[PDB]
Amino acid sequence: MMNSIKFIFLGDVYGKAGRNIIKNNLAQLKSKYQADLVIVNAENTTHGKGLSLKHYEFLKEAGVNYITMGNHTWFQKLDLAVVINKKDLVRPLNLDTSFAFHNLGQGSLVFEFNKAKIRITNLLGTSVPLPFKTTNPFKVLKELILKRDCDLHIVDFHAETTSEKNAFCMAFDGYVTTIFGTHTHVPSADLRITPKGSAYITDVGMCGPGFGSVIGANPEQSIRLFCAGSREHFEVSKCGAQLNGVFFEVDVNTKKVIKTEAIRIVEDDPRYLKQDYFNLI
Ligand SMILES: [Fe+3]
Ligand SMILES: [Fe+3]
After folding, report:
1. From the CA of 188, how far away is ligand 1's center (Å)?
2. Architecture of 1-281 per CATH?
3. Taking Cα atoms as reference points, which of 182, 166, 94 lies closest to residue 136?
4. Which of 137, 181, 220, 249 has the most neighbouring CB atoms within 10 Å?
């Protein structure tokens, strides 16, 4: 018989484009994989940064069960007290006490699902430039692990560097169920069940604007930044869309990952064809 739990983890939700492609495909995907639970990083949901209450309910009504965040966790000030306090939402645990919000919400949570105590933890890589101070991710997660209270442990490591990501993978490989990297907005072809029985991927990717955008932003301001050096406001792209995620199923008994598959959907937009960014635009 052997009962397992089938999950679906989606990368950084970015703007209206990300919101829409998830609403239009989650049911189908949930059905295709017979998924039991859906987890998503929603750090870029509202206007490319943070999550409004309105958008939190949207994701919730779209089928999302749990949410992890990142460096833009606290941008939507108006509803943060209410949003990040949501019981099924986890923010970076890795926060230094000098930072306001160091105690606003959960950095890790536990719930049980069919004879299984499941833990979801979110952390910030030391390689990510932040306006505030953070504690060491490696040390923090190690201490949490030594607390030994969970059969499954899902980790969303929001980091910038491939070296920090893989060093993290090497450090906690068998001590956790999954180590999924996020933050670069580009999926890696890294996905696999590790030699120790965990699931790993350098970066899940993003759920937001598609080809014709720069990591979710309008190309114009981006090209200018890298050319002239102008600091002109970033703008959310409305060009097409992409959905990136990971499907994985554990085994409640051995609590080892038994299967993994990368999930990807790309929608091109004809409006990109009319663009001529070459005129360093
Ligand atoms: Fe992001
Ligand atoms: Fe980020």
Report:
1. 15
2. 4-Layer Sandwich (3.60)
3. 94
4. 181
